[PDB]
Ligand binder design. Structure first.
Ligand SMILES: *Cc1cc2c(cc1C)nc1c(=O)[nH]c(=O)nc-1n2C[C@H](O)[C@H](O)[C@H](O)COP(=O)(O)OP(=O)(O)OC[C@H]1O[C@@H](n2cnc3c(N)ncnc32)[C@H](O)[C@@H]1O
Ligand SMILES: [Cl-]
Length: 387
């Protein structure tokens, strides 16, 4: 007998932030998750996430990144959980041969972001532990950094629940019944109704959006990260070793300084195994590339951070064809909001996206510019199943 104002399906990075934003405004909200967030079956574990501001992916991203940053600072003040550490983020690559580095520099210039430009040995000198060729250049953002992602979700959940949000765990939503004036979800633990629906199922959006009559190319990828024993005198956050995202000949890599001796963390961004979220092997090391692609980068660029493997994690990216997000109202139902395809780089924006989702669910519009995330854009190749 319990109707809600808004139901959020998938209470992870995006959904839990949305739940917090809704609860904060006195909106009767129900968040439903297949597990118990934060957990290790989706896209938010592995402890840390990079937040950068000079987003060359598209100008719309910078404002969202800056708003999210302010929102993370707000979250830091509201909870006892640690949210953000300002490690700074270093971006480097071969001079004149990296679109990623080039776009980053252009984005910083275009938005007047504070950054340091350096190249060659200046990089190796500023950060002992980094060894790049002399023909490499870099752009460093001193004011961006690292978010403790599980902590963020945990905090948003505690804050949302304190304000009345209900969270139904270990409950997989299996189907949807949408009406012009109400929404309804079906689960093994029962059916629930509300005036509005927010769908943010992460990797599972690739399998369940069809239940909403949507056909959108979304490919989940198995993405691992490893924590390695390192020279703490060089790679510790305490000696200001930065978070980083860089481009080398074989692709893009991202990493984090050692925090409290946990070891430098590294991930290979441009490669991953195509998988299904319900059959993915979540054990690190089952594929030789898991560990070898990481050490190949470390032995060449951060040689003192190539020690014993201390820990591994397996997580997922869900990509759209253009690698831009999907944040929009369902094309046939204005009372349904979709958040999907974050393509491996959405966590830093989750605070801002929660705000956008809240606005879309409550008003059908948002003050943020989200045109590049339109569910109707051509590059997405979106279509309805029944037309
Ligand atoms: C995996 C990964 C991602 C990543 C990264 C490193 C790795 C290894 N590094 C990042 C970084 O440095 N900076 C950044 O900005 N992003 C980075 N990412 C990407 C980011 O983690 C992802 O884009 C983000 O986490 C996506 O969030 P979203 O909310 O989409 O996904 P989720 O957190 O997995 O939450 C989805 C939830 O929905 C639930 N679920 C699924 N199906 C159902 C059904 N049927 N019913 C109910 N609930 C459902 C899940 O259980 C999950 O909690
Ligand atoms: Cl993702």
């Amino acid at each position: 007998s319990t109707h809600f104002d808004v139901i959020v399906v998938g209470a992870g990075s995006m959904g839990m932030a949305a739940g917090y934003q809704l609860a904060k405004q006195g909106v009767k909200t129900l968040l439903v998750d297949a597990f118990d967030p934060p957990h290790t079956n989706g896209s938010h574990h592995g402890d840390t996430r990079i937040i950068r501001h000079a987003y060359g992916e598209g100008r719309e991203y910078v404002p969202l990144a800056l708003r999210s940053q302010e929102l993370w600072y707000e979250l830091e003040k509201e909870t006892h959980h640690k949210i953000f550490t300002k490690t700074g983020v270093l971006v480097f690559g071969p001079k004149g041969e990296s679109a990623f580095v080039a776009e980053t520099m252009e984005a910083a210039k275009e938005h007047s972001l504070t950054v340091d430009l350096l190249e060659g040995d200046e990089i190796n000198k500023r950060w002992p532990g980094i060894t790049v060729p002399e023909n490499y250049n870099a752009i460093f953002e001193p004011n961006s950094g690292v978010l403790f992602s599980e902590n963020c979700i945990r905090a948003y959940r505690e804050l949302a629940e304190a304000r009345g949000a209900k969270v139904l765990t270990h409950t997989r939503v299996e189907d949807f019944d949408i009406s012009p004036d109400s929404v309804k979800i079906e689960t093994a633990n029962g059916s629930y109704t509300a005036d509005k629906l927010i769908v943010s199922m992460g990797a599972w959006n690739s399998k369940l959006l069809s239940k909403l009559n949507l056909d959108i190319p979304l490919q989940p990828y198995r993405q691992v990260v490893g924590f390695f024993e390192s020279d703490e005198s060089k790679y510790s956050n305490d000696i200001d070793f930065p978070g980083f995202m860089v481009e080398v000949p074989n692709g893009i890599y991202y990493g984090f300084p050692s925090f409290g001796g946990c070891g430098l963390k590294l991930g290979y961004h441009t490669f991953g195994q195509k998988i299904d979220p319900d059959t993915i092997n979540r054990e690190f090391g089952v594929y030789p590339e898991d560990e070898s692609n990481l050490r190949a980068f470390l032995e060449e660029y951060m040689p003192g951070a190539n020690g014993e493997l201390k820990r591994g994690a397996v997580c997922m990216y869900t990509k759209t064809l253009d690698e831009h997000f999907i944040i929009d109202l369902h094309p046939e139902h204005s009372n349904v909001v979709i958040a999907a395809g974050f393509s491996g780089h959405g966590f830093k924006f989750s605070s801002g996206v929660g705000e956008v989702l809240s606005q879309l669910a409550l008003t059908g519009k948002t003050e943020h510019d989200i045109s590049i995330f339109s569910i109707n854009r051509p590059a997405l190749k979106e279509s309805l199943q029944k037309t």
